[PDB]
Symmetry: D2
Subunit: 386 residues, 4 copies
Amino acid sequence: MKIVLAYSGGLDTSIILKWLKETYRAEVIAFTADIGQGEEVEEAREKALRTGASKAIALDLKEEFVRDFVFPMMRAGAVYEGYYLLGTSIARPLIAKHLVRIAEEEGAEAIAHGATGKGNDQVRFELTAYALKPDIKVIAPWREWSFQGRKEMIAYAEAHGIPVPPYSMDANLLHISYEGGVLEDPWAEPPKGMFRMTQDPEEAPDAPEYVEVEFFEGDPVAVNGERLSPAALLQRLNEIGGRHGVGRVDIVENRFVGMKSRGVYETPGGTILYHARRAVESLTLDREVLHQRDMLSPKYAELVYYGFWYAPEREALQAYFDHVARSVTGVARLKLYKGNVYVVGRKAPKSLYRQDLVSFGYDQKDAEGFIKIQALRLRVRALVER
Amino acid sequence: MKIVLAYSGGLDTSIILKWLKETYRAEVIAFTADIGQGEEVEEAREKALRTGASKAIALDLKEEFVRDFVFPMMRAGAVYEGYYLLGTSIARPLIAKHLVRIAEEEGAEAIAHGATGKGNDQVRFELTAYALKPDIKVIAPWREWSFQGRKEMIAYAEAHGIPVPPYSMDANLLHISYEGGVLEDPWAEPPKGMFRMTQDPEEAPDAPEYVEVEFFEGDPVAVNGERLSPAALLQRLNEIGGRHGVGRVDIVENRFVGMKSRGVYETPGGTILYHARRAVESLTLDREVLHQRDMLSPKYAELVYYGFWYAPEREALQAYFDHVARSVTGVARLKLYKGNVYVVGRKAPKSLYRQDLVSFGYDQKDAEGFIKIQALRLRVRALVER
Amino acid sequence: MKIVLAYSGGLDTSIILKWLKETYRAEVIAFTADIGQGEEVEEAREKALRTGASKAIALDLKEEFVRDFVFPMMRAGAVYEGYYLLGTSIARPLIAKHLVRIAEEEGAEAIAHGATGKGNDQVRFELTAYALKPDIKVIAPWREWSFQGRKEMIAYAEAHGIPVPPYSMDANLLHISYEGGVLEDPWAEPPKGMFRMTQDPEEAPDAPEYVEVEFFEGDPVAVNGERLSPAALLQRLNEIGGRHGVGRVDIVENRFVGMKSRGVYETPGGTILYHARRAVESLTLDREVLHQRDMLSPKYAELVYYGFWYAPEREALQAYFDHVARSVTGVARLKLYKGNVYVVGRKAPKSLYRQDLVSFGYDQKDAEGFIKIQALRLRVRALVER
Amino acid sequence: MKIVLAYSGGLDTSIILKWLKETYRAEVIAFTADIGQGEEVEEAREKALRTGASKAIALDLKEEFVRDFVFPMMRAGAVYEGYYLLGTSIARPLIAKHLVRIAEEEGAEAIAHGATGKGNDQVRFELTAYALKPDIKVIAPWREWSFQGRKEMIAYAEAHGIPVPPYSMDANLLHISYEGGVLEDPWAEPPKGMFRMTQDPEEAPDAPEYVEVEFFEGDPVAVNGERLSPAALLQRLNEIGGRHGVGRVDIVENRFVGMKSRGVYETPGGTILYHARRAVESLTLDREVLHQRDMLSPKYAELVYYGFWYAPEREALQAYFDHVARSVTGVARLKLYKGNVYVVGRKAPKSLYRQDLVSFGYDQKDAEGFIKIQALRLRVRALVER
Ligand SMILES: Nc1ncnc2c1ncn2[C@@H]1O[C@H](COP(=O)(O)OP(=O)(O)OP(=O)(O)O)[C@@H](O)[C@H]1O
Ligand SMILES: Nc1ncnc2c1ncn2[C@@H]1O[C@H](COP(=O)(O)OP(=O)(O)OP(=O)(O)O)[C@@H](O)[C@H]1O
Ligand SMILES: Nc1ncnc2c1ncn2[C@@H]1O[C@H](COP(=O)(O)OP(=O)(O)OP(=O)(O)O)[C@@H](O)[C@H]1O
Ligand SMILES: Nc1ncnc2c1ncn2[C@@H]1O[C@H](COP(=O)(O)OP(=O)(O)OP(=O)(O)O)[C@@H](O)[C@H]1O
Ligand SMILES: NC(=O)NCCC[C@H](N)C(=O)O
Ligand SMILES: NC(=O)NCCC[C@H](N)C(=O)O
Ligand SMILES: NC(=O)NCCC[C@H](N)C(=O)O
Ligand SMILES: NC(=O)NCCC[C@H](N)C(=O)O
Ligand SMILES: N[C@@H](CC(=O)O)C(=O)O
Ligand SMILES: N[C@@H](CC(=O)O)C(=O)O
Ligand SMILES: N[C@@H](CC(=O)O)C(=O)O
Ligand SMILES: N[C@@H](CC(=O)O)C(=O)O
């Protein structure tokens, strides 16, 4: 038996690699993806071999991540429960996709991940796996073993020769998530120094910085006049937004499995992109189109959050969003200053704005007719009330 | 003939007062509302009499404004096209409501206002008027007179003893709007020193300020432990938020009459309230209720923006929002710093958050069944696609 | 140990009654609800004591069923996937509500039901049970036992001395559902003579029959001038409609648990009510209110179908629907003829219909201005495409 | 000046033709479109040149109508206010399209239509025109002339030698609309014998008739195994459905211009197509995709109704609806009888239905886990309510 493990290189997944070998008497093929966690994935691939993997695979998936997952999601203007830009949410489907493919190539009947049974990650990995390969077998050790606590897990690791180095983290090219431990008390502010991707706003530059982001048919293609590939572009904006402490959010969210959870997120580059996109859309999108799009975004957001990425409902909404986004071509100019992002300008080759219609053709007399007709049903309602 | 004029006290409404008397051979009853514009309404009242009004009325409507218009709107989480907190939008219905009441008390067949034929305010005023009193006659001089240019307007005023004096402004307790003039170029950043209600972030304190806002059944009732009436509470938050320069937005919006317009807004207190409310809701609102509520907010927002306040659609949705909002009871803790409003904590008497559900009753294995069932239709789809 | 069982008096819930006694060795309180199945619940209550119940309770819940479940649901215009009027769906919550109530009165720690593991009913009973009493224990024999066939169940029945006898049925005052067996082939028309509640249209009266339904504030209060209580009213309309073979539906629906199921339903009285309501709503509901209401109806429907009756989202939506329904006061006149229901007239004390508005409410130029303004954005769009 | 007139051939439109030659002293180009009104457009054409047209054009647009307008709309499941299948609505855009093309070809400056200022048709013609050619000049005689009363128009008619004679009618391949006159009283059943396209139910065949419709990627391509072009197919279904009295609707609808109107419609072929499509969708569309689509259908419906065919909102939604409809391939089997349409069967080469999922990837214990997780938030809620 062969099992393809999503190996992040940490303590828990290393414990899982061991546990899988013994419990299933299986050959474990470790897969580590580089999606911008800021870590030498090759080191995790070597640790996996030391830990007992019969084979270790590491891939640079940053470009595929931004191009095929992050960009499509952003076109939708996806925001979960008012703030979450879904940094972890869109990354999981990608990893699950490669697990299934690798499982297919290696003749492995199962795949494994180390997401716990009380989070959303388990759902994203499995819904993806099942949607792509219906009869694949999935093993989630956190839902199968019986370790009674951290202590017991540390002992198991030590006993297996696994190095055993106040909150949990998940990092990638889009954001860094923080939750658990000290963060579990929603009345407690996150501890000073926790943030890594963004600079403390209190330590940000004393001078604001301007940045321009160009969009072509829905996707950002340039920063300050320099054309950059999807992954290189997100990275550049993370650097620029990061230095100024942009993109910090603190929320108590609703997990798909039913309980509320306190999460803290930093999405410097994505936050700039959120406002840059809406800035360009403000010149290129039609009013009714915009309003309809915004009322569907939330639904799309929960689909991503819940894990329905490779799902027909999400693909269907995607058809709508992509259609709408094709008109998003132009440039957004933003001003960054101590944690904040300010839109200060925007332009587009096919802008729908006409100073013609606001400055003092158009006939004010038309407005009276418009108002009279719009008011008809209201007046009838009033007359009936009497 | 008696005409009740919404009289702001400026040059144009003064010109209008004179214009109405002669054009309609009628007496004009001027009505100036104090909704927090930051001016002495008694001075407008006195000027109205000097300009020729047979009667001038001035009322302090700050409490009614915040209590009966601002709060109900905020409960719905109303946000127009991603950023506009509707500062001017919710104030107009209030004014028109009084215009119609005064017309009935005075025996006036008509009411008048000085909103132009190319803006949104004309619609708000008229839809309100017609909704409350369907047989009311409305007179909008901008859509009726023959003035050709601003120069002829000054001459007309000077000739009538009316005193004569970059962008246009509208200020009240909720915000200050800036549009027109140099702002008409969407690529140009607004001019330095334009903002009045908020201090530039560059000048804001280097020390962040923590602020707590208590919510009771959907409405903010206290700030930092001090109970404040609606208007006094908004005022307080405008002061605290204003000093830190919070609540500035720069957008190109879609007017109801059809054209795009570049608008700049500062809503210090309202912006704090927006995030404070969501912070309390994150503990007091059920997941599914929240998601539904958020998908209806944009619709309610456009209704307010278009002027359908005293309209059945709006009141129907208000029934939904008010039902939901009633559960919003608790305290939000925010950190204000150079333009930003950061949520750092939240608590509630009946919080739905359970640390025992995230900490490491609930059974991991239940999750497997959940996922399997959730995945069935996706697996069937995959098998059919063969 | 005590266990309150939702006992319908049939072969399986009887088998289940025996099974529970042997499996748990607990006293089993049988509960049988009269919701219009057209059965003598006293016979079931005696067969229960006969079968082994330590106590058998039978309650007439017809009025509560229609008044507190069917009517509130109908005010929302609830329709699942185009045709299902949710006859079985709104019934289960009522039953579960009593099971929990009894268990609390009898000091029983657990409740049980005979819904299978492949359907929706299991979810409805349980979500209702847990929502009302969070720590109540639920037992679902179909998910726990070992019978591997019908033959084994019958054998087990005789072995225990229980009376033993092409599709499954569920009947109550709202409808009769038929699914399973022969119906599992979606290309196969249901068998002749299957329907019980409605008379085959080809054997229905040759002369159409007219019926008038009076609505008051959202609920039907009279039929052909006769004031009838909720249950008596639904009953009366089942008679009138059944006679004509009205309300037959055949669909392949999506169960909440993942798979498609072929269902056939007969809802005579409810189908008349569906159309009578809309007829009265056509004169009493504002255009925008209706349009918004209709876009929410489908959501409320799936909530009812999935089993989220005693859930915050449904109750929140209910506040919106009840608010709108309050205006639905008037009379609908329908024509019934061989399986079909035809609206032929409607009137209302506060009808918003005005013949003077259509006869040959505004000036002609008014419509021109309305059109010009509505067209503005389309013309700008065209010009930009230049 | 040249004026292209959408000329139907009736009394009113012939008068308009004279009025235009006389009032404007312009060279009138008549345009009659054959869209299945059941009339020799060649006659209308000759009656035009006769009446005074400097030219008359008649075009057979039946195929374009069904293929480019009716099908895309049906693909969306468009239904206005619960019953209206939009027969007249989707036709107007087609006519205005050619009106504008002809005017461009004939170098005309204006176009004219005979829709009154009280209805929706004026909006449909004009929004379409402006959207296609923003500079187009539009003339609506009903809004510009001075006739008061039917008598006057007759006089002016008999004066120029034009042929002169209970309700108004509009017919095309999709339906026949009846409104006005005796129909204006909502409580008054339509007059016996009014219907033309549909045989009266009471005089419909004594034996039911079965019919099958094949769909390929969203559109019906055959009837009873016979492949038929869009128009030929709608024609055939009109014949079959017509003989049985299928597709009659009687409603009080809300016009875009503000007032309620009592309309009666007969859409035999279209009604069969509506139920056939949903029958094929029941096997070919995913649950969540279907539920989302249905919540959007009503919006698309009002778009069509209001006249926003060639509008960005509609085209954006069309992308979603077309994406979803591409999966709709299969066959629906319906039973027609005495005015009703009963779905009795359906099949699809890629059906998502699996009998093995319902008959006695799916395990028992799974349902329990699903239920528990789904119930969590409800349990927490109850607990908090103590
Ligand atoms: N870069 C990666 N490559 C492959 N799989 C990954 C990667 N990052 C995360 N995963 C998968 O996602 C699952 C993990 O979650 P999380 O990111 O919450 O895991 P951990 O890193 O295992 O635990 P923690 O940091 O909370 O102690 C992992 O157990 C692993 O299977
Ligand atoms: N505080 C107020 N009290 C009464 N009416 C008001 C008030 N503020 C605005 N209005 C009404 O709204 C209409 C105005 O618009 P806007 O607010 O755009 O006017 P202005 O151009 O600011 O003022 P003015 O017309 O005096 O020069 C006014 O002409 C007036 O009729
Ligand atoms: N009238 C009723 N009173 C109480 N519980 C009922 C009633 N009707 C249905 N139920 C509950 O719903 C569950 C049943 O389902 P269904 O209606 O699918 O059962 P059956 O299998 O058709 O009938 P039976 O098992 O009694 O022969 C039952 O096992 C029972 O717990
Ligand atoms: N077959 C057609 N070809 C071209 N234009 C048409 C056609 N049918 C209708 N129209 C256009 O649509 C507008 C009409 O409406 P309707 O179809 O309601 O008009 P009528 O036929 O003019 O009036 P009536 O109610 O008396 O029959 C017409 O005035 C005409 O300009
Ligand atoms: N530290 C973590 O394990 N966080 C992973 C991201 C969790 C986040 N609440 C999400 O659902 O996407
Ligand atoms: N300065 C102004 O006249 N602005 C008034 C508010 C206009 C704003 N765009 C609104 O529509 O509410
Ligand atoms: N015979 C049955 O057990 N049917 C009960 C109704 C099932 C229906 N499909 C529902 O889900 O409500
Ligand atoms: N007879 C008519 O003139 N009817 C034209 C169609 C009217 C229909 N109520 C519609 O709005 O489409
Ligand atoms: N990654 C965490 C959190 C989550 O999945 O939501 C876990 O595995 O539980
Ligand atoms: N107050 C401005 C702007 C607006 O009403 O939208 C006007 O009268 O035009
Ligand atoms: N009553 C059937 C069908 C359903 O519940 O949906 C069962 O118990 O499976
Ligand atoms: N065709 C009719 C009705 C409508 O347009 O709605 C008219 O011209 O008024």
